[PDB]
Every structure is written in structure tokens, then in C-alpha cells.
Ligand binder design. Sequence first.
Ligand code: HEM
Ligand code: HEM
Lengths: 115, 119
Amino acid sequence: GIFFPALEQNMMGAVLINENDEVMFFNPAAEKLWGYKREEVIGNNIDMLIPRDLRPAHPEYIRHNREGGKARVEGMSRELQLEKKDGSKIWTRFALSKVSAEGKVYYLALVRDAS
Amino acid sequence: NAADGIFFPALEQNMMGAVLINENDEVMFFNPAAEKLWGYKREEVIGNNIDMLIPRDLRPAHPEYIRHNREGGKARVEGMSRELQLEKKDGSKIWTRFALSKVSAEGKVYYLALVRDAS
Ligand code: HEM
Ligand code: HEM
């Protein structure tokens, strides 16, 4: 269809995760933001895409959002610091969305450069 | 068909509005997030031209913006992200944040504008 090509060729990065926080999607816009190729990210946990200073705390924020039930995600509204592979940091804007797909809970983070 | 997958429900249940148009400038997609931004139902937008979602003061210039990008090619390069004044159905105006993209599929050209509230 036109839905896979739309997110794949989106100017905004697109990081979909499944029920176990495993990255199932990582388009070329997200490859330039994070400095990771899609081969390095797919299958592994979300941990790598989270900054190292926020690594310990972030898994509890995802788990709490799943048990809540709420459709609309109110978190990650203002500018946040994305960390790349090489360690350098750029400012960004996340548009996080809960996605009821395949009888499970997902999360799509649409990211852009807000430098 | 597409609702059984993961990519349709990603854009359909996205917090950002999602307006897709095909090669003939006809809106083939209009999720519930875009229904609240524009004040239009999905039935009022699907099948109709793109100029209905453009503000009336920007209607003279917008058909020539789309036409130029189609003739350009440029080995494909999405476009841009900026803040644009959206005009609703009732006539009121809110400021937003578009994120226009260019998506080649089946040898045709489409455009997905991801919108959110910037007020
Ligand atoms: C640049 C990398 C990221 C950073 C720095 C980051 C940072 C944060 C922070 C600080 C919070 C807690 C604060 C708040 O409510 O805003 C949060 C919440 C959350 N994040 Fe992340 N995040 C990143 C990437 C992601 C990705 C890729 C996903 C999944 C696609 C994700 C999913 C979530 C979820 C589900 C919450 C819970 C929000 C809520 O309870 O409403 N994050 N993030
Ligand atoms: C709130 C309604 C909209 C407004 C006010 C608006 C405004 C504009 C403006 C001002 C430009 C010129 C580019 C610039 O000066 O930055 C433009 C270009 C363009 N617009 Fe719209 N737009 C709207 C909705 C849409 C939608 C929904 C689509 C299709 C999904 C679309 C497709 C395009 C395309 C393909 C271009 C050419 C980009 C370029 O090469 O400059 N517009 N629009």
C-alpha cells in the first residue's frame, strides 16, 4: 500500500517498538538523527536509542504508560536531547503516539531536528 | 487489509494529523487527528481536491507550489518542516507545525503532511 512507503520516506525519523520494547521499524530519517543504520537497531531493545544518562529511568516510564490504558500519550511534549552513536548530542522534537496494532500495544516516535 | 498490519494503525492512531494526497491532488487519507485540527469529518475530505484544506487567502498560490515540486524531481527529497496558519471549516484560524514529505510508490507521486498544534 501507501502506508509503509509514507513512514519509510518521511522526513521525520520513525521508531516503532513492539510490546517488548523491541524496535521493529527504523527509517532513513532516523538513521541520520541517531547515527545508527537500521540493521544495527532492528530486533534489539529500545535501550540503545535512549541517551545513556536516561538509560535506567526510561524503561519504567514505558511500563507505566502501558498499564495506564490511556490512548493519548501526554509525555515527551517539549524539546528533548537525543544522543547519537558517537556520543554527540542534538536537540529534537518527539511526537509520541500509542498504536493499537496486531492485538498489542506499540509506540511510534516521530522525530525532527529542532537545533 | 492494511488495518491488519502495523503501518496503517501507526498513521491512523497518530497524535499528529495525517493528510495524504495522490498524483491527482485528491485526499486519499485523513485520520481522526486531522479531523480535530481542521474541523472536517473524514467523509467531507476524502475524494476531494487538496485546495479545500488550504486557507482561502493562500489558495491562489498553493496549486503552483505543488505543481513545481512534481515537475522538479530532484532525485526525491521530501521537502521541509515549518509553522503554517491552518484555516478550519468554521473560519477560525490556529497556528500549527507541518512536516511535509514526498513518497514515491508504484511510479507515482504522493505527499504526506504531518500536522500538530503549535498554539
Ligand atoms: C531521544 C531518545 C529519547 C529520549 C531522550 C526520551 C526521553 C523520555 C523521557 C525523559 C520521558 C519521561 C518524561 C516525559 O513524560 O516526557 C519519556 C517518556 C516516554 N517515552 Fe521516551 N525518550 C526517547 C525515545 C523514546 C522512543 C523511541 C520511544 C518509543 C517509540 C519512547 C517511549 C516513551 C514512552 C511510551 C514514555 C511514557 C510517556 C508517558 O507516560 O506519557 N521514548 N521519554
Ligand atoms: C494548512 C493548510 C496548508 C497550508 C497553509 C500550506 C501552505 C503551504 C506553503 C506556504 C507552501 C510554500 C512553501 C513555503 O513557502 O514554505 C506550501 C507548499 C507545498 N504544499 Fe502546502 N500547505 C497546507 C497543506 C498542505 C497539504 C495537506 C499538502 C499535501 C499533503 C500540501 C502540499 C504541498 C506541497 C507538495 C508543497 C510544495 C513544497 C515545495 O516544494 O515548496 N500542503 N504549502
